Design a protein around this ligand. Structure first.
Ligand SMILES: [Zn+2]
Ligand SMILES: [Zn+2]
Ligand SMILES: [Zn+2]
Ligand SMILES: [Zn+2]
Ligand SMILES: [Zn+2]
Lengths: 284, 460, 66, 344, 351
DNA sequence: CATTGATGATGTGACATTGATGATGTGATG
DNA sequence: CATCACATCATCAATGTCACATCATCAATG
């Protein structure tokens, strides 16, 4: 059962800047690259030549890291070439970093990279009808702050959720960041069947790597290792911002709101609601 | 099957660690492992602390501890670990030679034999000397199975085949027909035949100039990568070099002539480990080059051909004349009674025709497989997947031809109690060593597996 | 290890009985019997066993195709 | 059997082809006929020869023939030589025949226009859902000592007689009464057949019969469910108004030739309009297993599937011994039955 | 050479919570030999297909199923929020066989009776499946049509190889005049596509009716394993969900509460609806020689697009169907799969 | 108890078979 | 080497061998 390893490791020199900034400057994410390179060699060994891939998110975009986009136009001899290719790629992307790169700090291109990974996976799986891969992915984040909960990218994150679920794809996660449970990714792995890795920085991750993210490719009979509970009291009222439990859900807009509603024209969609219906709501 | 893994375990412990000396051998032997074991290995390789069994006991949830014991019993069988009743527990730890060699291979080990080849200008294209390798391999197939000329000049190769009594004809008079070993050779396609003969080469040279671990390292380097430059030049012991030279004589070395070069890595040894799509003057016509016709008509309908494969077909069938894209042949009760004269069970042949000659029965197996697996419980009756009328008349014929059915093995004895007989009887319902038995007689005529696992449990 | 080398033939007890008939005929080359469904034989005679098996069984049957 | 439902009035076609002494030469209308004095050269009457010469005298603008194959053509060649006609018609029965001489009667009458097609007349509404079967009636050593005692065809019923065969067929009978299906049983034997017919004891069919009771059992077969088993003797062929088949049991297995069996089956599986069962037409071949007729039953199923109809074997009878009237189930009573069949 | 929806109007409000009722005809008409197995069993097949399709794509809606036989119409499924009830109902049907003819009026009236307890936010649509050439009514037809479309229920019908303009007139009535719903077919591929578009929520130019809020809450998964106990089937429930206020246990289902009767989903279903809220601008095939972009795919990596002038072949389809608002590429399979499964325009989501 | 008729009886036609006897191949030979 | 002579093989045709075919006889029917 050959399987595909699609590791998603973000590299924001902002997130990496936090990575060094948290704790000491005793070891850069270079260690993370190393542990990942070793782990990729491991997964490649694991099966009889089972394919893999990796992409990462710039401050201003993304690029296929393993695949070696059309550019011309040791150990097994092949772990060498894959990793070395990768190293040239990542450093050359490190040329793609400067003040203009230090400008594009509006969004987080995690979701788009995730989707494109799913897309290329499907491009194989639909292209690879013969030798059907039983594939899955991994997420990596040198976690940081300065944007407590970026909510903009949450929707297509859910869309990727369903994309994998229908595509029947395990998706495990390793966030390496401050003591913040990424409920987005938390419930993502939760439903879409991954394993939650909220870790600290300087530990040699190799152990967690080889342990927690070898389950799926064909197996999944083992006790999963999630974090503590995965409550589904979901995103807050769009107006209030405090996490909401008993739904006050607006309309075809589906703006999720609190006991607030302005009596009309929910503060996401310009669409009125019968004020007598508002009396029916406040009949509580 | 003798199950090359079992031969690996067969050698005693000290020589097994003699072979863990090569991390390349470490990985190669890791790759045959059960994924149960493979994963558990990878778990243990680096937590530098031996471990009790119960952790892996709790690793498996419900049904699947069967393969858990598969993993542990097999790993015990080749002793890659050392079980340890240290504190009365099972303090599991690998052979630290095995684990350390593999670990070095994980991060650039010192196994230069794993990379004894050299990156030089290898002039070998895919078709480059390749079609020559396919020609020689087909030549051995024809000569051993019986070619119009059995042109095998491998007096060494013929000696390796005969010394094990592989192919059976009047050998003193020169007859070498497909014996029981020869019929099975008609059966083990590539991995089957390639492995039977890799072990035949093992047997031919096993005492004198053995260099057993070194020869094994040569075998695994062959199975590993195209030796390319400097392989035969440098990366081999003189004994391993002679083994590689014979392998080239056996085709298994895809190097040029003249006895001076790096190791030319022919696809034979790559596939020997890989077990994938098996296709190897200046012509070659695939993929559908394999030809046959086998449907529920009980008849041959062939357009493509492979004169080796056509010889195989003619084996279990009658023939009258060769034609454009078909040969004169209809499969019957008599046609397979032929193979049954060689005793050749038409039990290989069922899944063989489910393996062979589908290169011309692609629509046949796509119409009659129908992907009737999700539909297997939906629409209950399977849709001729695979064709069971064919198996029915074949099987039926065997039963008919099973009037004086014979059994293999020998009649075991010294059974005293129903405790270990209940035990050994159910465990032979479990490992499948039993055909028939009875405590009442304390008798059964089977192979020695039950005996093997009870003999091993009782003594060590 | 404990066993006795042989060629274990199994069939319905009638067929075993006929086999042993022809065997008693052929100087009785069944090394031992285990029961009505089991016999112990030597492959230095069982093929000739099939020989006379076919001989007498066809002399009886003769298969007219009719 | 047909022509009076059909559009003729019986007053004109005189059946003294060779049969009677009938109205030769006064048939205002056509004549229905055979080959039995036309030239079966035993013309002893001369009214016989008179119908011959009368066939000569009037120029028969058309001639309708049926299965002349068994007849030597020579006689028919002489008769058509006598008629001075100018056209004919030949309705063939088998594909390659004995009147296929240097003159095939084809070019004598005319070209082939249509050919038979079973696969086209037994999978829609005419003879759809057709399935064959060959039960292997459990052997018992008495049959094997009969095999041992002799090599003579006398052994035929000696294996046919199997009481387990009666039990399988009796489950089929209780089943098709339970299914409302119709059961055809073929048996060329007389003795063991009447023993079973007593053993089952419904209004049953046998040889040697005067026949208004066969009309009774045909209707009360196509008309009554209390009686749901008929045994078809070789007296059935030829020819009868062949019963349609919902459950055909065949016991006698020589029936030489192979094409004899062919016509027999293409007649027995008559156009049957019942579709309640997923396989409305069951063909059964009760053959005692481990016997002389194993080869013949294998050849039977071989020729079966040679020509299209679905075939199977269910040798796992649901309560094979739970069936009532377990008559002669004892190997021993089986032995007495074989004694009697030796006597029959 | 394109056959493409020029204007994909979707940025508005479609019918989301649809009380869908497929109706079936199991008559001697569905037997007839024009389809490969038959009309009948093939219809059962594609109906099962639609059960899965719908309850996937509309995983917050409800359904009941009705068949028609022997001048009579027969429901086969109570309003059910578990797919398998419909699935096994369809199984139990396929083995039963068709007879007689459709009493269209009775089916319409049974459906009319059914969808009454559906509130406003819950919308009402029936789904005819027709293959007959006539009906059998016991009640005045346009009478009941008046009642139906007077109670705000559009219907989509799928007739077989004919046309019956009463169907078109009744639909046009139910569909506020404008008609597209009398889709009949000429091929089986055609058939399944008909299904797949029947799945999606259906707008035309909405009558601006009441936009009502919907209130609910969310349950929570259980912890104890042995504690098996249920209140929705009264069976053993080794762990499941817990009404946000009524705090009863519920075996896995997106259903409404069975104690205080409120809806219970997580969030995922809302997200599917959003995927049906703002679908994207269609990937325009870049102009042949005027495109001259990078020579691969962006979403995937597909280096093929042209052979650079083979007179005819390369000058055919310079296939770089790239997005509109993002203008970022994606190959033909990428376009098909993006627009099909994960609309999820990364190039447009990217910035 | 006359009658008519269904069904066995034995006469007779037609071809398979086996065999007696010519035919021509071949050895001996002057 | 040309010749005749035995020597197995070919071919008409009796033999018998069975099979349809009208005639005889018990026995129900009215
Ligand atoms: Zn809103
Ligand atoms: Zn419940
Ligand atoms: Zn509640
Ligand atoms: Zn693409
Ligand atoms: Zn876009």
């Amino acid at each position: 059962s050959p399987s595909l390893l699609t590791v998603i490791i973000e590299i924001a020199p902002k997130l990496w800047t936090t990575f060094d900034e948290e704790g000491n400057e005793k070891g850069s994410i270079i260690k993370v690259l190393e542990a990942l390179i070793v782990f990729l060699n491991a997964h490649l060994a694991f099966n009889s030549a089972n394919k893999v891939a990796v992409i990462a998110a710039y401050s201003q975009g993304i690029k296929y890291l393993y695949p070696e986009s059309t550019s011309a136009l040791x150990x097994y001899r092949r772990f060498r070439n894959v990793d070395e290719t990768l190293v040239e790629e990542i450093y050359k992307l490190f040329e793609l970093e400067k003040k203009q790169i230090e400008q594009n700090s509006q969004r987080s291109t995690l979701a788009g990279a995730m989707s494109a990974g799913l897309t290329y996976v499907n491009r194989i799986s639909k292209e690879s009808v013969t030798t059907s891969l039983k594939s899955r992915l991994l997420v990596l984040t040198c976690g940081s702050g300065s944007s407590k909960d970026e909510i903009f990218q949450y929707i297509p994150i859910m869309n990727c959720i369903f994309s994998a679920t229908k595509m029947k794809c395990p998706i495990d996660v390793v966030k390496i960041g401050g003591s913040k449970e990424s409920t987005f990714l938390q419930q993502t792995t939760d439903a879409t069947n991954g394993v939650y890795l909220h870790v600290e920085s300087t530990e040699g991750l190799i152990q967690y790597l080889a342990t927690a993210m070898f389950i799926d490719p064909s197996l999944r009979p083992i006790i999963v290792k999630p974090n503590h509970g995965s409550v589904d009291f979901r995103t807050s009222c769009y107006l209030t911002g405090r996490v909401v439990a008993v739904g006050f859900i607006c309309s075809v807009c589906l703006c999720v709101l609190s006991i607030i509603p302005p009596g009309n024209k929910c503060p996401a969609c310009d669409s009125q609601f019968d004020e007598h219906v508002i009396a029916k709501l406040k009949r509580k | 099957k003798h199950s090359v893994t079992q031969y690996l375990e067969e050698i005693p412990q000290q020589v097994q660690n003699r072979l863990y000396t090569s991390p390349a051998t470490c990985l190669a032997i890791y790759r045959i492992l059960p994924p149960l074991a493979k994963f558990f290995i990878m778990a243990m390789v680096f937590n530098e602390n031996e471990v009790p069994l119960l952790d892996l006991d709790k690793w498996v949830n419900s049904n699947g501890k069967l393969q858990f014991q598969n993993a542990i019993k097999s790993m015990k069988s080749l002793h890659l670990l050392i079980p340890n009743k240290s504190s009365g527990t099972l303090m599991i730890n690998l052979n630290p030679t095995f684990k350390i060699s593999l670990r070095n291979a994980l991060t650039g080990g010192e196994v230069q034999n794993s990379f004894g080849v050299v990156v030089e200008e290898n002039v070998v294209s895919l078709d480059l000397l390749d079609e020559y390798s396919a020609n020689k391999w087909e030549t051995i197939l024809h000569f051993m199975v019986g070619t119009p000329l059995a042109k095998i000049p491998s007096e060494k190769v013929l000696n390796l085949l005969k010394h094990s009594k592989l192919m059976e004809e009047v050998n003193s008079t020169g007859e070498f027909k497909i014996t029981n070993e020869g019929f099975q050779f008609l059966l083990q396609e590539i991995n089957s035949q390639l492995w039977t003969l890799l072990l035949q080469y093992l047997k031919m040279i096993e005492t004198s100039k053995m260099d057993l671990v070194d020869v094994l390292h040569f075998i695994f380097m062959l199975g590993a990568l195209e030796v390319g430059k400097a392989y035969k030049i440098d990366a081999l012991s003189e004994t391993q070099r002679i083994m590689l030279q014979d392998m080239r004589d056996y085709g298994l070395v895809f190097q040029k002539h003249s006895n001076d070069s790096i190791f030319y890595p022919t696809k034979l040894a790559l596939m020997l480990t890989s077990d994938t799509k098996t296709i190897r003057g200046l012509k070659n016509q695939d993929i559908p080059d394999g030809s046959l016709i086998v449907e529920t008509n009980f008849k041959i309908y062939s357009y493509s051909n492979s004169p080796l494969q056509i010889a195989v077909l003619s084996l279990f069938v009658h023939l009258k004349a060769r034609f454009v894209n078909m040969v004169l042949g209809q499969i019957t009760r008599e046609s397979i009674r032929r193979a049954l004269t060689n005793g050749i069970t038409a039990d290989q042949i069922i899944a063989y025709l489910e393996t062979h000659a589908h290169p011309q029965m692609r629509r046949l197996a796509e119409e009659k497989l129908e992907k009737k697996l999700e539909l297997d419980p939906n629409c209950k009756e399977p849709l001729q997947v695979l064709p069971p009328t064919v198996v029915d008349q074949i099987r039926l014929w065997q039963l008919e031809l099973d009037r004086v059915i014979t059994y293999e093995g020998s009649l075991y004895s010294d059974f005293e109690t129903s405790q270990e007989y209940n035990l050994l009887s159910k465990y032979a319902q479990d490992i499948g060593v039993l055909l028939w038995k009875d405590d009442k007689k304390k008798k059964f005529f089977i192979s020695k597996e039950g005996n093997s696992q009870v003999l091993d449990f009782a003594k060590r | 290890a404990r066993a006795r080398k042989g060629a274990l033939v199994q069939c319905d007890p009638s067929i075993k009985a006929l086999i042993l008939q022809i065997d008693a005929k052929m100087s009785d080359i069944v090394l031992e019997e285990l029961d009505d469904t089991h016999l112990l034989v030597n492959p230095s005679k069982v093929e000739f066993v099939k020989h006379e098996l076919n001989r007498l069984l066809s002399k009886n049957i003769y298969n007219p195709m009719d | 059997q047909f022509l009076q439902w059909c559009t003729l009035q019986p007053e004109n076609c005189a059946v003294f082809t060779s049969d009677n002494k009938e109205m030769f030469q006064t048939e205002s209308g056509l004549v229905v006929s055979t080959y039995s004095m036309v030239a079966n050269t035993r013309n002893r009457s001369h009214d016989s020869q008179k119908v011959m010469d009368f066939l000569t005298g009037r120029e028969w603008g058309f001639i309708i023939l049926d299965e002349v194959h068994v007849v030597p053509a020579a006689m028919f060649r002489r008769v058509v030589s006598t008629i001075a006609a100018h056209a004919k018609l030949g309705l063939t029965a088998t594909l390659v025949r004995e009147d296929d001489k240097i003159g095939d009667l084809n070019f004598l009458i005319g070209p082939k226009l249509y050919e038979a097609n079973w696969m086209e007349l037994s999978q829609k509404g005419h003879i759809a859902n057709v399935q064959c079967a060959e039960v292997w009636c459990p052997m018992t050593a008495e049959f094997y000592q009969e095999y041992l005692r002799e090599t003579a065809r006398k052994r035929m019923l000696l294996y046919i007689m199997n009481p387990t065969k009666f039990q399988a067929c009796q489950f089929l009978i209780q089943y098709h009464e339970r299914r409302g299906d119709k059961i055809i049983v073929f048996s060329d034997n007389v003795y063991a057949l009447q023993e079973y017919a007593l053993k089952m004891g419904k209004p049953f069919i046998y040889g040697s019969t005067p026949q208004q009771e066969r009309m009774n059992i045909l209707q009360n077969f196509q008309y009554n469910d209390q009686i749901n088993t008929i045994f078809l003797s070789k007296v059935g062929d030829t020819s009868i108004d062949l019963p349609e088949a919902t459950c055909l049991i065949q016991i006698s297995s020589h029936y030489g030739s192979r094409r004899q069996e062919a016509q027999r089956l293409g007649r027995i599986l008559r156009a049957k309009r019942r579709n309640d069962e997923g396989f409305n037409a069951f063909f059964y071949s009760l053959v005692s297993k481990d016997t002389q007729e194993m080869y013949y039953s294998t050849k039977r199923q071989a020729f079966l599937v040679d020509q299209g109809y679905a075939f199977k074997v269910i040798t796992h009878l649901h309560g094979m011994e739970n069936i009532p009237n377990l008559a002669y189930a004892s190997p021993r009573e089986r032995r007495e039955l074989l004694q009697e069949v030796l006597l029959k | 050479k394109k056959r493409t929806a020029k204007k994909n109007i979707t940025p508005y409000q479609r019918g989301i919570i649809r009380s869908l009722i497929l109706t079936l005809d199991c008559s001697e008409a569905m037997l007839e030999k024009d389809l490969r197995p038959n009309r009948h069993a093939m219809i059962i097949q594609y109906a099962i297909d639609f059960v899965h399709e719908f309850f996937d794509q509309n995983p917050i809606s409800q359904m009941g199923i009705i068949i028609m036989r022997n001048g009579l119409a027969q429901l086969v499924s109570q309003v059910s929020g578990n797919p398998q009830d419909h699935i096994d109902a369809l199984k139990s049907i396929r083995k039963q066989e068709p007879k007689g003819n459709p009493s269209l009026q009775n089916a319409l009236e049974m459906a009319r009776g059914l969808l009454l307890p559906v509130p406003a936010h819950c919308t009402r649509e029936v789904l005819i499946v027709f293959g007959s050439l006539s009906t059998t009514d016991p009640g005045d037809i346009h009478q009941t049509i008046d009642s139906l479309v007077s109670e705000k229920i559009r219907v989509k019908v799928l007739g077989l190889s004919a046309q019956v303009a009463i169907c078109k007139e009744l639909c046009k009535a139910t569909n506020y005049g404008d008609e597209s719903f009398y889709k009949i077919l000429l091929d089986e591929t055609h058939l399944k596509e008909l299904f797949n578009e029947a799945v999606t929520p259906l707008p035309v130019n909405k009558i601006n009716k009441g936009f009502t809020l919907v209130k609910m809450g969310f349950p929570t998964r259980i912890f104890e394993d042995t504690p098996t106990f249920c209140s929705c089937h009264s069976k053993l429930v080794y762990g499941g969900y817990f009404c946000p206020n009524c705090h009863s246990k519920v075996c896995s289902l997106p259903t409404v509460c069975p104690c205080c009767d409120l809806m219970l989903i997580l969030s995922t279903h809302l997200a599917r609806s959003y995927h049906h809220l703002m679908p994207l601008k269609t990937f325009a095939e870049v102009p042949t020689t005027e495109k001259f972009r990078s020579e691969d795919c962006f979403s995937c990596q597909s280096r093929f697009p042209x052979x650079x002038x083979x007179x005819x072949x390369x000058x055919x389809x310079x296939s770089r169907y790239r997005c509109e608002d993002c203008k970022q590429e994606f190959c033909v399979d990428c376009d098909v799969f993006i627009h099909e499964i994960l609309h999820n325009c990364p190039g447009c989501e990217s910035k």
